[PDB]
Amino acid sequence: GNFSQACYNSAIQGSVLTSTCIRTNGGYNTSSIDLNSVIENVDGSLKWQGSNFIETCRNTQLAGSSELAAECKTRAQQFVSTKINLDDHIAAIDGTLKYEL
Numbered sequence: 001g002n003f004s005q006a007c008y009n010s011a012i013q014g015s016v017l018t019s020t021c022i023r024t025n026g027g028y029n030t031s032s033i034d035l036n037s038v039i040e041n042v043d044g045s046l047k048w049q050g051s052n053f054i055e056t057c058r059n060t061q062l063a064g065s066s067e068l069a070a071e072c073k074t075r076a077q078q079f080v081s082t083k084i085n086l087d088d089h090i091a092a093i094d095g096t097l098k099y100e101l
């Protein structure tokens, strides 16, 4: 992971992370990744190893350089605040954001 060390000007809109990442040729590239493919809302908490959090969460934000923050519904249908460190699994490879397992 650790995209945040390779990238800057990052933003979250909905479930999409955008960022500008360094390229090996000396330049940079702007890219994006849909975090909804790789993050699950598990009883109100954002977790890896699943998908589709955006269906039952609201008010997504980037906190600091790498934290996804949101408000997500529990199984009992009430909202809690939750966060996950995108640096756990989101990497930058030659200027492009990629998920790494």
Ligand SMILES: OC[C@H]1O[C@H](O[C@H]2[C@@H](O)[C@H](O)[C@@H](CO)O[C@@H]2O)[C@@H](O)[C@@H](O)[C@@H]1O
Residues within 6 Å of the ligand: 039, 040, 041, 042, 043, 044, 050, 051, 052, 053, 054, 055, 056, 057, 073, 074, 075, 076, 077
């Ligand atoms: O319904 C879509 C939802 O399914 C799964 O989440 C379950 C649970 O973890 C949630 O707390 C409640 C919230 O209503 O929904 C399900 O019971 C996950 O795959 C989740 O990412 C997805 O949004």
